[PDB]
Amino acid sequence: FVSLDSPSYVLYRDRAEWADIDPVPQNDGPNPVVQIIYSDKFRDVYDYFRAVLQRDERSERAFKLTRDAIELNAANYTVWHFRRVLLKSLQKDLHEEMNYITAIIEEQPKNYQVWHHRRVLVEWLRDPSQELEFIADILNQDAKNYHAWQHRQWVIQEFKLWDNELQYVDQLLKEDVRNNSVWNQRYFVISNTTGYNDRAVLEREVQYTLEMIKLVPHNESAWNYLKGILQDRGLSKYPNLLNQLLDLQPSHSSPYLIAFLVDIYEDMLENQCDNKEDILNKALELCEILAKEKDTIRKEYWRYIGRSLQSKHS
Amino acid sequence: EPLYSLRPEHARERLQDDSVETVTSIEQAKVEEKIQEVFSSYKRLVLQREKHFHYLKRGLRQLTDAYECLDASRPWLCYWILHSLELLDEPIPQIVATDVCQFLELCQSPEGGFGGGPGQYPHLAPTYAAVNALCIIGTEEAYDIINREKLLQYLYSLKQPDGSFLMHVGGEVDVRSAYCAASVASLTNIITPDLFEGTAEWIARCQNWEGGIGGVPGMEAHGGYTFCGLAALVILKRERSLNLKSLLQWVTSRQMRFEGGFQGRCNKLVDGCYSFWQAGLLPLLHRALHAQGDPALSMSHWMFHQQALQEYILMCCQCPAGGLLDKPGKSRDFYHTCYCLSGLSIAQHFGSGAMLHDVVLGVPENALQPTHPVYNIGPDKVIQATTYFLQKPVP
Ligand SMILES: C[C@@]1(c2cccc3ccccc23)C(=O)N(CCCn2ccnc2)C(=O)N1Cc1cccc(C#N)c1
Ligand SMILES: CC(C)=CCC/C(C)=C/CC/C(C)=C/COP(=O)(O)OP(=O)(O)O
Numbered sequence A: 001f002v003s004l005d006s007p008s009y010v011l012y013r014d015r016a017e018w019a020d021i022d023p024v025p026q027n028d029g030p031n032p033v034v035q036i037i038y039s040d041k042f043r044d045v046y047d048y049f050r051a052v053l054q055r056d057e058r059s060e061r062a063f064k065l066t067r068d069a070i071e072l073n074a075a076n077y078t079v080w081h082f083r084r085v086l087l088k089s090l091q092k093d094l095h096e097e098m099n100y101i102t103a104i105i106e107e108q109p110k111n112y113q114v115w116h117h118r119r120v121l122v123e124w125l126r127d128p129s130q131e132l133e134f135i136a137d138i139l140n141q142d143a144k145n146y147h148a149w150q151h152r153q154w155v156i157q158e159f160k161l162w163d164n165e166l167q168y169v170d171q172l173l174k175e176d177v178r179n180n181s182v183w184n185q186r187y188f189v190i191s192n193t194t195g196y197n198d199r200a201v202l203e204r205e206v207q208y209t210l211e212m213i214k215l216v217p218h219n220e221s222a223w224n225y226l227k228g229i230l231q232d233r234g235l236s237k238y239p240n241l242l243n244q245l246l247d248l249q250p251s252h253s254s255p256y257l258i259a260f261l262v263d264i265y266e267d268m269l270e271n272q273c274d275n276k277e278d279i280l281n282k283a284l285e286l287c288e289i290l291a292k293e294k295d296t297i298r299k300e301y302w303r304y305i306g307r308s309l310q311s312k313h314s
Numbered sequence B: 001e002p003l004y005s006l007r008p009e010h011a012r013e014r015l016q017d018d019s020v021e022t023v024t025s026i027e028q029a030k031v032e033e034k035i036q037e038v039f040s041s042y043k044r045l046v047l048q049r050e051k052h053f054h055y056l057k058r059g060l061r062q063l064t065d066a067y068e069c070l071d072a073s074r075p076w077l078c079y080w081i082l083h084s085l086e087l088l089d090e091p092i093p094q095i096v097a098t099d100v101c102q103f104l105e106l107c108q109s110p111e112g113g114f115g116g117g118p119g120q121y122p123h124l125a126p127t128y129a130a131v132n133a134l135c136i137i138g139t140e141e142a143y144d145i146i147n148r149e150k151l152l153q154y155l156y157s158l159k160q161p162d163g164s165f166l167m168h169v170g171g172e173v174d175v176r177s178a179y180c181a182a183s184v185a186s187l188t189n190i191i192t193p194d195l196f197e198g199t200a201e202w203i204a205r206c207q208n209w210e211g212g213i214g215g216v217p218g219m220e221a222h223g224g225y226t227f228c229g230l231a232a233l234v235i236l237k238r239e240r241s242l243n244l245k246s247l248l249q250w251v252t253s254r255q256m257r258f259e260g261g262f263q264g265r266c267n268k269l270v271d272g273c274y275s276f277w278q279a280g281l282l283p284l285l286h287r288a289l290h291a292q293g294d295p296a297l298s299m300s301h302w303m304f305h306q307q308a309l310q311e312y313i314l315m316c317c318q319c320p321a322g323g324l325l326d327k328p329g330k331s332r333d334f335y336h337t338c339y340c341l342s343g344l345s346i347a348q349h350f351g352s353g354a355m356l357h358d359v360v361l362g363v364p365e366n367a368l369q370p371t372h373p374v375y376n377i378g379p380d381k382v383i384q385a386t387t388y389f390l391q392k393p394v395p
């Protein structure tokens, strides 16, 4: 009833209305292992939970006891599960619950169970009207929160909410173009809307990507996107690009462009392109510039790449 | 300077924000700065075993109220600690061991699987921890605790129509579960013909444009989930179901050029625990690519800078009081201890049939005990465990 941090907070044993129920101690065995020295405020609430649960007292009061148990350890799925058992059985205001979880997810955004709970609620109500707005608020405090982005992808796909996600992405890339979670959301939207088969779309994307690379050449996320949207369909399938990059070599040649280059040749030595040997040398030469001067951390990778480019080509 | 992290040329790996600022570059630059000083300071590396031993030893028995947040993950607490005692090659007393078996038995549900602690509902994550902690112990007493029937019956209650599993009853879905189910189904010899039906194919939908694997289809490629899926595939022998080349280009990209360590996802921060979750992926690929006949595989090294990781763990991840951590400025904890040490072990030992070549920076005492890249428990703990259960029925 009274919040765990309130000055006038009283343990559960010292509470009247909780007298008829005996506290159930935790059974850790004769000589425990990894036995946590729980604080008194902690051990109290759970000793009482182990009770209403051990009885399955699907009572309204045990429903209130769940909030406190969840507060002390939001990661307790046993408690959360029993909270949904009571949620149903006592027919509580699912609209009041959304209000709860919103505050919990706000105070403990990086927790698994808080988010899963919110889903179950949206499902039950079959109502996502507050979703986007809420996830954007959490994301506003942490643009990369995984649990957030995952819940966001669910909403959209479940309730056909693609309409504004792209614009959302664009806004967030503005704020931080290095946000790899938003470049992922970008691929997500498109893939389930226009797809990248449409030349006008694919077209727009490459320019935008390129413009971002130009704007911030060392932001790996953009390179990755460019690669992801072209790679499987065939880099060798788009000749201009190969050149439009080896024309920025002087003013831009970070290890990211050199690396992309090697990516392109490898696809040529695949679909078979003229001067199959001139390429090989253009690739090996590059693997060593990487494995020796510009990407020494990846030397064992590039050494293998080169070795494979021969091995299997020749 | 024989250290890759401490030479003058290495000081060129600092972030190039191209004069543009975002909350990402700023943070990347803040870790690099703190990593600079740590590097600086030093100009041989030692693994504070004793100091770590006490930390581990104490923990195993008692924890401060600081661990109230991991109350529903106690079997994890066992595994993380026992495994760090394993790596550091420290024998486990028969009373310690038994008490562990006794504890994990009160966590085991009457329906199969295990719970976070005594009386808790069964969950795949803690179940994995126990079956893993039980095998590290290695005795018959250990093994015999697993209600091999109940387990399989429990995995079956979580399996979904799409090949994916639930974490626990009424819980969410993500590649972590398939790994938990796969790891326990394999060690205990309980895989029935249709158990992982369409699983390999689900784990596969989790790989994305990045080359790595997300929690669920569509999500960003993360290093913890990627290990979860590739390793699960290694168990089910479906490694081939993934574009391994893109997976390899990706995982290898995850190692930081400056820090030396790995990040969990592109454009984020370096963490000591990723020394396993990410670097552990290499031994796995190396295996699959070998099973394909790849002739270009190195014969003495892992496809990642083994010296740099070690240098990151040895210079930046140890706590004076003992234990290893995320990054400098973070408080020690048993999970980062387990995976920092697990990482190191992988950074030191190379396998591939007869080909065994070990790298061991710092002193010789720093050398650790090997760990099986698929279960993260002693290579021998695995052979020993599967053997025992193979000499058992299945149904
Ligand atoms: C809290 C949790 C976690 C909880 C339960 C089971 C897990 C099993 C595998 C990996 C993480 C697990 C979890 O959800 N994450 C993921 C989110 C935070 N994170 C990601 C990379 N490094 C930290 C953990 O890293 N854990 C481990 C952790 C964090 C702080 C202290 C201790 C200790 N001792 C352990
Ligand atoms: C077998 C098993 C259960 C494995 C788990 C592997 C693992 C490391 C999972 C993490 C998933 C997650 C929610 C990451 C976000 O971390 P973050 O945002 O805190 O940090 P980061 O940005 O550096 O990833």
Ligand SMILES: [Zn+2]
Pocket: B271, B272, B273, B274, B326, B336
């Ligand atoms: Zn970590």
